[PDB]
């Protein structure tokens, strides 16, 4: 077939560009930052009226000071949330403080390109 | 048609990568010959130095594997040296484990088994070389055993390898049909080399200077190669009768 880590002639990773298409099909998520706080909102999008909507969990707590909304293949997010929670708690264990929002984000993004053969 | 790229069977029950490896064997355009005396085994090979910038002393396809075993290769030098280093390693390991010098026919079998694996395992390619092992074995006496990329090996009364092998083979066949013996009935190795060079000249129809040939001799308890001046003395003796 072709490598999973292959570059396109335009200098973009095929598999990354394709995943971005999967995210476009996902339910909407919005975030707004203010000086009084940050708001996170999601569309639940139940596939049937018999589906108990309150079981649809697309907004998730990472730590007391960090929330998270998701869009796309939401099952893929479970291990990313797991890593984020582990990073936030592990940092609090090692340094007796709350981890910076940028550092937590950077930690999650380090998983992203760990794919190949 | 990926059955021609790796070593899996074709519908005809053939391994094409093995067949193409046999073709690589003649890429050097060099012919080798091996004969047996009473007390010795002689191997002669054509030497070609096409570039004046080359150091002719480093251009060789004959290898001293152990003190007793010599190996001439028909094929490209990278694969020749790959096979040489492995045979040298295997010969040394054998002596350490089993406490006696690896026989010529046993090293042949081992290198042939390694070759067989490259024909059965996909990730490894065959080596594009034919290996001719010579020695005076302490049990079997003068010995010639030859390996190929199929992993085939057999003993030989005499043998020839390279583009013009069939011409040399028939020349040797005809001599042994007259004499009705499995060797050259000669005391000295000097005269057995003279026989080897003479029968190569007759078979290829070409004359040789001292720099055109490359000679390896196996006696009891050592294998050695001749210098240009040692070959010159051999060429003078042939011309003077």
């Amino acid at each position: 077939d072709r490598g999973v880590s292959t570059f396109s002639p335009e200098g973009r990773l095929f598999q990354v560009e394709y995943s971005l298409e999967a995210i476009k099909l996902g339910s909407t998520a919005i975030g707004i930052a203010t000086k009084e706080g940050v708001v996170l909102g999601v569309e639940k999008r139940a596939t049937s009226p018999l589906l108990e909507s309150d079981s649809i969990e697309k907004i998730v707590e990472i730590d007391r000071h960090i929330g998270c909304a998701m869009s796309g293949l939401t099952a893929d997010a479970r291990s990313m949330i797991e890593h984020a929670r582990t990073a936030a708690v592990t940092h609090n264990l090692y340094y007796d403080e709350d981890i910076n929002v940028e550092s937590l984000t950077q930690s999650v993004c380090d998983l992203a390109l760990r794919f190949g053969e | 048609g990926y059955d021609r790229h790796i070593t899996i069977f074709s519908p005809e029950g053939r391994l094409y990568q093995v067949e193409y490896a046999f073709k690589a064997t003649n890429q050097t355009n060099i012919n080798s010959l091996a004969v047996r005396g009473k007390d010795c085994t002689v191997v002669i090979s054509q030497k070609k130095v096409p570039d004046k910038l080359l150091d002719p002393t480093t251009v060789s396809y004959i290898f001293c594997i152990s003190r007793t075993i010599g190996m001439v290769v028909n094929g490209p030098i990278p694969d020749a040296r790959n096979a040489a280093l492995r045979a040298k390693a295997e010969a040394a390991e054998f002596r350490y484990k089993y406490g006696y010098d690896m026989p010529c026919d046993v090293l042949a079998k081992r290198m042939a088994n390694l070759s067989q694996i490259y024909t059965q395992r996909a990730y490894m390619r065959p080596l594009g070389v034919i290996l001719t092992f010579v020695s005076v074995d302490e049990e079997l006496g003068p010995s010639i055993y030859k390996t190929d990329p199929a992993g085939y090996y057999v003993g030989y009364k005499a043998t020839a390898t390279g583009p013009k092998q069939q011409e040399i083979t028939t020349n040797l066949e005809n001599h042994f049909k007259k004499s009705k013996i499995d060797h050259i009935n000669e005391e000295s190795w000097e005269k057995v080399v003279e026989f080897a060079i003479t029968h190569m000249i007759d078979a290829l129809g070409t004359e040789f200077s001292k720099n055109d040939l490359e000679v390896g001799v196996a006696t009891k308890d050592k294998f050695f190669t001749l210098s240009a001046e040692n070959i010159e003395e051999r060429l003078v003796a042939i011309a003077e009768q």
Binding site: - | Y96, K97, Y98, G99, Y100, P103, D105, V106, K109, E138, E139
Partner: protein, 225 residues
């Protein structure tokens, strides 16, 4: 007591037939002479399990080597393979062996100690009875021994061990390996220690022993019909 004696056209090895656990005689007719290959035999002393295991393993690998090379096995091969194995285990495999045999190279006699050391000799002895055996060998050995002389010397050296060593006893086992001949294994070559008739028959009258219960034991498989 195990000895090896080189002779004109071959090598002979002999051993006693006693194995002991502490001061108790476990086996009155033990076999200390082992076939590594048809014409390569060795005698073992030390841990009985160790000498049997180490001769069987090397004997197996020697047989595979012989088949691979199409050559009769050499003593130097069995020797080399034994010493490298024993050395690996730093003497924890307590195998002390006298390795003899004839091959295309000629006749050979070696001894191997449990730490992985070997030595060459015309006469060797090993085990608790080695000093008794070596005393006879050092007294009666000469260069250019005949076959008959070498068997006599070897068995005499074992007798010295049987009589004067508490760890040695019972019978003398010999194996002669002559160049260009079949190795002859002479099991119980001498029987110097045969027990005498007892004074009494201790055969009991039937019904002497009190039996609580009796039952048939089913050794047959599940039956048909």
């Amino acid at each position: 007591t195990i000895v090896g004696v080189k002779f004109n056209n071959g090598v002979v090895i002999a051993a006693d037939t006693r194995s002991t656990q502490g001061p108790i005689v476990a086996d009155k007719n033990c076999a200390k002479l082992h076939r590594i290959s048809p014409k390569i035999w060795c005698a073992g002393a030390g841990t009985a399990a160790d000498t049997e295991a180490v001769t069987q393993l090397i004997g197996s690998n020697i047989e595979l080597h012989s088949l691979y090379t199409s050559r009769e096995p050499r003593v130097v091969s069995a020797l080399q393979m034994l010493k490298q194995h024993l050395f690996k285990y730093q003497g924890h495999i307590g195998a002390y062996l006298i390795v003899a045999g004839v091959d295309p190279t000629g006749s050979h006699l070696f001894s191997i100690h449990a730490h992985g050391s070997t030595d060459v000799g015309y006469y060797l002895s090993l085990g608790s009875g080695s000093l008794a055996a070596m005393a006879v060998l050092e007294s009666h050995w000469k260069q250019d021994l005949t076959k008959e002389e070498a068997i006599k010397l070897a068995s005499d050296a074992i007798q010295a061990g049987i009589w004067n060593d508490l760890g040695s006893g019972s019978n003398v086992d010999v194996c002669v390996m002559e160049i260009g001949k079949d190795a002859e294994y002479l099991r119980n070559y001498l029987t110097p220690n045969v027990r005498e008739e007892k004074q009494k028959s201790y055969k009991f009258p039937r019904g002497t022993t009190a039996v609580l219960k009796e039952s048939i034991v089913n050794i047959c498989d599940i039956q048909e019909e």
